[PDB]
Design a protein around this ligand. Structure first.
Ligand SMILES: Nc1nc2c(ncn2[C@@H]2O[C@H](COP(=O)(O)OP(=O)(O)OP(=O)(O)O)[C@@H](O)[C@H]2O)c(=O)[nH]1
Ligand SMILES: Nc1nc2c(ncn2[C@@H]2O[C@H](COP(=O)(O)OP(=O)(O)O)[C@@H](O)[C@H]2O)c(=O)[nH]1
Ligand SMILES: [Mg+2]
Lengths: 50, 49, 46, 51, 431, 50, 50, 437, 107, 54
């Protein structure tokens, strides 16, 4: 084994299929859809911020 | 998110009721456990509904 | 009134009377430089 | 995840039947809308994991 | 397949044991419903030591909850992980204890003792090979002290071959939390001496110092304290539940620690404990784990081992580690602290290794210390006993519900005899 | 029927009923439940510790 | 007032003597014994009480 | 399950009971009709109220209280106004003739007229109770019903109910302010008969709370409503652990065991902290050590007996709110190291802690500021021997000429009861002297 | 007039468990055994016959009203601890006076 | 030996993530207490004015 028994070679953002990915309700294994850069939290401190 | 270790426990400070519903009580001479339908504050439980 | 000042205490909390006597002796000394009645207080201040 | 979406939607469109002045944008309707959005986001993440 | 019957008495017992059940539940993978939801088969193999097959995949604890008054037991039921318990294991009266030993033991504890014996008999006869009982309570109150001692005595009478563990959190050096706790602790330990196989004395001041110094923890609360006690319970029973390189059960620990039947009061301790913001500064090795074990501030007993001598030590490690490293570390600490160990017993250390550490941890360790420093705790309780016994304060109560002064005299004489033996095997030399 | 002269009495004026208080207003939010920054929101490097 | 100040000083000296006895008892068990300094301390204790 | 029966006897008892049950209704969310504001499920559904309120088949909360007086004015004022539908009308016992500040009238005359009906109502309430914890009896050591009928009722309760808890909340006559004239006579005669038939008696005067409202609350002219609100806060902090979950629970059977060192010594004091207003609490950082020091300060005591003059025997500290036991332990340790607070030599373990997580509720339009933590400080000290000596001196001054004795004798009490009562409190006075060493 | 036990259920049917906070009355638990042919020792009227060991208690039972209770009550100390010798003596004195007055009022 | 070193590194990094998360939650709870105290002062200013007393 080229890695410890308690670890996996793939990561959370690495999970990809080997064969053709099935069509499951629009979501496809391998694709990452929109990156959605707008989810950056508002850390300004104004009322209503994060 | 934290693993369950003695130094990694946190509590909600905005809880404001802290009641105690007498689920465990008696009847006319017997010990009646009774199932709890409500927990501490007054919210319903979330395990056996 | 003097008719109500010769009464022994209702409680006996000293086992043998020897310890009672040997405590109230030097307690009657300790009542000086106290606060309030019976000398049960702090030793005032300076 | 399916049932809290039902809870939030039924609460929203039960509270929409309030009378004239009682139809108020209280700070519970905002949180309930954000709950709808968060439920939909969590359902999307779980369906991605399912795929 | 061995079994442990766990009994928890008093409000302190019903809090600490509930926390213990919750810790071992989310260590074995049991959900708040009661079903198994773990990943490995090791969590499922040795599960009967604490649980019973209720419904398919549902496992119920073997707990017996005892109280004179339904106080914290109701809050335990209404809290998280509170419906895993069998609903008729809750045995409860309606009168109070009043932090009164005789109320817990003689008058008001007499009406519940038959029901508790019925419940624990039903629990114990279901096990194919029962190993022992584990009682959690406090030596400061009425339910934890009186009913606890009565339960230990009756369980010893019915089963005089099983291992009796009692945890029994003891009165603090500073701050009281009960004004009659010298009487309560003396009258309780008078029967804990002659009945229990082993007792793990825990001090809340030691727990507070552990939280403040080794854990920062500006808002500790009792949850972290019961969590630490629960971690020590899991550490002392982990060799039954998970396989390891060197196993040691409760009977093996009892054999390897107590030299004489009177001396069975221990100092539990847990490692590793890290202040929040120091895990990057520390590196996990077996030497630092062992040194944190043998540090004087790490044990949950307020008495200082430097004011005494270690009769025996039990070290139960949990994690993938080397037996050479473990034995070398025990040899190193024994050789360097050569004045803290009794000279007439070589290798005052019983080691055990479990292969399954707690989740989120690589290595964990449990230290059990039978030392002669327990005489400080017993001398403190004896001094605070004889301070008020000479004036008969708070004793008209105990006389009112009906014991004699000869019981108090016998209890204080038994405590003084235990102090004398612990002092004798601290200055006794080999040759 | 209620009694409309309780203002003369001392116990009526000091015992007139008003509803209770709930302490946090319905805009107070807890920041402990916000999502973590991505440096601390990593993956669990240990998968099978048994 | 002056005599009470002197009494306070005497009691403080009593507390110092008790502390000195405890720190002397802190000593290793090999020396211990009965010393002329110990007899002087007991004599001082008696003189302060008188 | 943890049921308690509250017997409020006398005008002081009934007014304190008004201010108490108002706070209890505000705590348990009960309207002055007996009904939940919401339905059976939401806004409630718990059973935490059963310590004080029983539940009929429909969902109406009725209190476990018995309101007793011999005059009809105050009881009828309760019957007609605000909480007119909450209190049970059969639990609102009143008579025709008042006792008119007379122990013997309350003990042998009109007080003995009503005791059969009062015990009937009490036994009906106890049959309702299913795990009764004790009787909280609210009265004064003033005149009339608060002395005579309270002592007679407690004698009958000790006769029929055995050794059940009988916790008194007693209004003690202040050293300077006192309303009646025959008040020392009544107080001597009622402490003589309530020495034996009692378990514990929390002693709360009026002048100390007047000084507290002047100094800490800035009312500068408070009244009986404010006084009874503070007494209601005290009794709520005492009874809180039977209704709200806490780290350390304290039940009513424990106060006697942890506050009565010897028989006939069962008179502890009371203190609530932090009793303070909003414009002063704005500038403070109120924490465990600060409120413990405020409790042990000899100015927040709610009876005019400064603890500098005596030694503590027992100390019940009831912490209530978002309080942490670590800071509780640190505060009690620094109090023990403090020297002005003096504890008796035969009691090294002088403290008893009860921690409850429920924050202190506030009455709308009340006096106290809302705080996250509070302490009920409950001390048994020998400083009350000064008050007993002063009251015995007042009795001896009144009894040397034997004024106001013809009333008592000519309506029915033997004159030897005066002498034996003064002998009993002389024995008590020597008892406190012997305990103090 | 016969509260003759319940064996397994003696834990229940207790006055403390059935909401009776008053002190309870002690009937005779654990029934005894007889031989047979019990004497009739009566007539068809309600009489007790001649030579029967008639009791010396009141035929109307023992109960005292409020206006015949003692003016002073001891207080049920049952402890006799940390009290002086005259305290023990006069506590016995009031207990004896209590018992005598209740016996005289019943009889 | 590379496998053992990587296992030790993985456990170490998991613990660093864990206690940094715990410290962040500690500071979040401290800010929560600060905001609760500010809201309490605002509530006292709003409701408990002496003119509103009975
Ligand atoms: N704290 C407080 N004390 C009160 C209150 N009302 C009366 N008192 C006290 O009661 C004393 C007067 O005697 P009461 O207790 O009212 O007499 P009573 O119990 O009504 O019996 P009678 O003498 O027949 O009227 C005064 O000295 C007050 O200290 C009250 O509302 N609050
Ligand atoms: N560690 C810990 N100790 C507790 C807890 N609850 C109570 N105690 C201790 O228990 C002692 C009081 O005894 P108690 O349990 O009330 O006796 P009981 O009234 O008979 O149940 C106090 O000294 C507390 O320090 C808890 O949750 N954790
Ligand atoms: Mg009146």
């Amino acid at each position: 084994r080229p890695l410890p028994y308690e670890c996996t070679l793939t990561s959370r953002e690495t999970i990809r299929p080997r064969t053709e990915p099935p069509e499951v309700d629009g979501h496809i294994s391998g694709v990452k859809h929109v990156p959605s850069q707008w989810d950056v939290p508002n850390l300004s401190g104004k009322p209503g911020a994060a | 998110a934290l693993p369950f270790l003695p130094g990694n426990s946190f509590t909600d400070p905005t809880q404001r009721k802290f009641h105690r519903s007498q689920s465990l009580g008696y009847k006319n001479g017997y010990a009646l456990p009774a199932r709890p339908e409500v927990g501490i504050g007054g919210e319903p439980l979330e395990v056996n509904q | 009134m003097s008719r109500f000042s010769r009464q022994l205490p209702h409680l006996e909390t000293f086992r043998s009377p020897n310890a009672h006597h040997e405590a109230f002796a030097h307690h009657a000394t300790d009542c000086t430089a106290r606060t309030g009645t019976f000398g049960h207080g702090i030793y005032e201040s300076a | 995840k399916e049932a809290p979406m039902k809870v939030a939607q039924t609460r929203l469109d039960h509270r929409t039947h309030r009378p004239n002045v009682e139809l108020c944008r209280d700070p519970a309707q905002y949180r309930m809308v954000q709950e709808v959005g968060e439920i939909q986001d969590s359902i999307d993440k779980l369906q991605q994991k399912l795929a | 397949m061995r079994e442990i019957v766990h009994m928890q008495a008093g409000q302190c017992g019903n809090q600490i044991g509930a926390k213990f059940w919750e810790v071992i539940s989310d260590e074995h993978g049991i959900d708040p419903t009661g079903t198994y939801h773990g990943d490995s088969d090791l969590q499922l193999e040795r599960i009967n030591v604490y649980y019973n097959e209720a419904t398919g995949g549902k496992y119920v604890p073997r707990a017996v909850l005892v109280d004179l008054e339904p106080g914290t037991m109701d809050s335990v039921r209404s809290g998280p992980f509170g419906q895993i318990f069998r609903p008729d294991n809750f045995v409860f009266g309606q009168s109070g204890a009043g932090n009164n030993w005789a109320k817990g033991h003689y008058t008001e504890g007499a009406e519940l003792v038959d029901s508790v014996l019925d419940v624990v008999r039903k629990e114990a006869e279901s096990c194919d090979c029962l190993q022992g009982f584990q009682l959690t309570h406090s030596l400061g109150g009425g339910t934890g002290s009186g009913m606890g001692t009565l339960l230990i005595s009756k369980i010893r009478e019915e089963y005089p071959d099983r291992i009796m563990n009692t945890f029994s959190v003891v009165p603090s050096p500073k701050v009281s939390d009960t004004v009659v706790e010298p009487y309560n602790a003396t009258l309780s330990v008078h029967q804990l001496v002659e009945n229990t196989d082993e007792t793990y004395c825990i001090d809340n001041e030691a727990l507070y110092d552990i939280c403040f110094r080794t854990l920062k923890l500006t808002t500790p609360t009792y949850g972290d304290l019961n969590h630490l006690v629960s971690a020590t319970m899991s550490g002392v029973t982990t060799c039954l539940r998970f396989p390891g390189q060197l196993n040691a059960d409760l009977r093996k620990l009892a054999v390897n620690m107590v030299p004489f039947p009177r001396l069975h009061f221990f100092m539990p301790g847990f490692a590793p404990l890290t202040s929040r913001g120091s895990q990057q500064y520390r590196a996990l090795t077996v030497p630092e784990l062992t040194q944190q074990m043998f540090d004087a501030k790490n044990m949950m007993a307020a008495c200082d081992p430097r004011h005494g001598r270690y009769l025996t030590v039990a070290a139960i490690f949990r994690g993938r580690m080397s037996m050479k490293e473990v034995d070398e570390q025990m040899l190193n600490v024994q050789n360097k602290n050569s004045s803290y160990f009794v000279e007439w017993i070589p290798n005052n250390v019983k080691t055990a290794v479990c292969d399954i550490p707690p989740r989120g941890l690589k290595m964990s360790a449990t230290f059990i210390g039978n030392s002669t420093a327990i005489q400080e705790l017993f001398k403190r309780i004896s001094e605070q006993f004889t301070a008020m016994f000479r004036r008969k304060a708070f004793l008209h109560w105990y006389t009112g519900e009906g014991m004699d002064e000869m019981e108090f005299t016998e209890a204080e004489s038994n405590m003084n005899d235990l102090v004398s033996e612990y002092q004798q095997y601290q200055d006794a030399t080999a040759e | 029927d209620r009694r409309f002269d309780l203002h003369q009495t001392s116990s009526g004026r000091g015992l007139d009923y008003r509803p209770e208080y709930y302490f946090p207003a319905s805009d107070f939010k807890t920041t402990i439940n916000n999502p973590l920054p991505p440096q601390l929101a990593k993956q669990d490097e240990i998968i099978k510790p048994f | 007032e002056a005599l009470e100040k002197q009494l306070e000083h005497i009691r403080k000296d009593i507390a110092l003597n008790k502390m000195s006895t405890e720190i002397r008892c802190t000593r290793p068990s090999r020396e211990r014994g009965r010393d002329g300094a110990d007899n002087v301390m007991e004599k001082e204790f008696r003189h302060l009480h008188q | 399950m943890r049921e308690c029966i509250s017997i409020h006897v006398g005008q002081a008892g009934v007014q304190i009971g008004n201010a108490c049950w108002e706070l209890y209704c505000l705590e348990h969310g009960i309207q002055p009709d007996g009904q939940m504001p919401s339905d059976k499920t939401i806004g409630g559904g718990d059973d935490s109220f059963n310590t004080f309120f029983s539940e009929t088949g429909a969902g109406k909360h009725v209190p476990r209280a018995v309101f007793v007086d011999l005059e009809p004015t105050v009881v009828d004022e309760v019957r007609t106004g605000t909480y007119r539908q909450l209190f049970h009308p059969e639990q609102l016992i009143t008579g025709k003739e008042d006792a008119a500040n007379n122990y013997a009238r309350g003990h042998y005359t009109i007080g003995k007229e009503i005791v059969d009906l009062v015990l009937d109502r009490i036994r009906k309430l106890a049959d309702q109770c299913t795990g009764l914890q004790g009787f909280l009896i609210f009265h004064s050591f003033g005149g009339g019903t608060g002395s005579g009928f309270a002592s007679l009722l407690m004698e009958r309760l000790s006769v029929d109910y055995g050794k059940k808890s009988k916790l008194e909340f007693a209004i003690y006559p202040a050293p300077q302010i006192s309303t009646a004239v025959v008040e020392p006579y009544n107080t001597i005669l009622t402490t003589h008969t309530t020495l034996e038939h009692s378990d514990c008696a929390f002693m709360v005067d009026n002048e100390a709370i007047y000084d507290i409202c002047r100094r800490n609350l800035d009312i500068e002219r408070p009244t009986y409503t404010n006084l009874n609100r503070l007494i209601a806060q005290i009794v709520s902090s005492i009874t809180a652990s039977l209704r709200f979950d806490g780290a350390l629970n304290v039940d009513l059977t424990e106060f006697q065991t942890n506050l009565v060192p010897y028989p006939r010594i069962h008179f502890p004091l009371a203190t609530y902290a932090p009793v303070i207003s909003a414009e002063k609490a704005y500038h403070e950082q109120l924490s465990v050590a600060e409120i413990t020091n405020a409790c042990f300060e000899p100015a927040n005591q709610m009876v005019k007996c400064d603890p500098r003059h005596g030694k503590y025997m027992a100390c019940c500290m009831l912490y209530r709110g978002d309080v942490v036991p670590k800071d509780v332990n640190a505060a009690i340790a620094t109090i023990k190291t403090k020297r002005t607070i003096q504890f008796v030599d035969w009691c090294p373990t002088g403290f008893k802690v009860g921690i409850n997580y429920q924050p202190p509720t506030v009455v709308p339009g009340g006096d106290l500021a809302k705080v996250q933590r509070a302490v009920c400080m409950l001390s048994n000290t020998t400083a009350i021997a000064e008050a007993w000596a002063r009251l015995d001196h007042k009795f001896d001054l009144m009894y040397a000429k034997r004024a106001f004795v013809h009333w008592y004798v000519g309506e029915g009490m033997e004159e030897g009861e005066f002498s034996e009562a003064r002998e009993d409190l002389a024995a008590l006075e020597k008892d406190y002297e012997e305990v103090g060493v | 007039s016969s509260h003759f036990s319940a064996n397994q259920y003696k834990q229940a049917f207790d006055s403390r468990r059935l909401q009776n906070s008053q002190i309870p009355q002690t009937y005779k638990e654990r029934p005894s055994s007889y031989e047979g042919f019990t004497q009739i020792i009566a007539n068809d009227r309600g009489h007790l016959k001649q030579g029967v060991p008639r009791s010396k208690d009141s035929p109307w039972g023992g109960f005292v009203g409020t206006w015949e209770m003692p003016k002073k009550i001891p207080g049920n100390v049952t402890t006799y601890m940390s009290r002086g010798d005259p305290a023990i003596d006069n506590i016995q004195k009031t207990r004896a006076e209590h018992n005598e007055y209740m016996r005289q009022a019943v009889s | 030996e590379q496998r053992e070193n990587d296992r030790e590194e993985a456990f170490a990094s998991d613990m660093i993530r864990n206690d940094k998360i715990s410290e962040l939650l500690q500071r979040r709870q401290e800010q929560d207490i600060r905001n609760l105290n500010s809201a309490m002062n605002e509530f006292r200013d709003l409701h408990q004015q002496p003119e509103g007393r009975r």
